[PDB]
Protein: Microtubule-associated proteins 1A/1B light chain 3B
Organism: Homo sapiens
Amino acid sequence: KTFKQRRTFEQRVEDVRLIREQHPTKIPVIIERYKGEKQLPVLDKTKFLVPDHVNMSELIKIIRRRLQLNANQAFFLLVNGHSMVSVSTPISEVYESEKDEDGFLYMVYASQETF
Ligand SMILES: O=C(NC[C@@H]1CCCO1)N1CCOCC1
Ligand SMILES: [Cl-]
């Protein structure tokens, strides 16, 4: 069901190396709905190539637009399992400290801060 379940560590590693080769300016992001989530829709895809200059605040706006949310639906984004310390950090910096050992940056969204 989840990304890590669907692909071998070997397969996730090789895919990241290919994004490096073909999309060198992009951060490879996995974005998944919280397994408990009732309110928000599922995304149309799992794997996102994010321009490495956007900050976390802009990435939240991007996903809220992708989900076509309205102004009073809540949305919380976890990175590498935990809350974002700041939305002003550039995703290139977030990648280097939060990336998985397979080389993806793993995010999860929910309508509650309590996931
Ligand atoms: O996956 C995405 N785009 C892939 C790009 C577009 C052209 C080459 O690959 N995006 C969704 C998340 O926001 C950034 C854009
Ligand atoms: Cl690129």
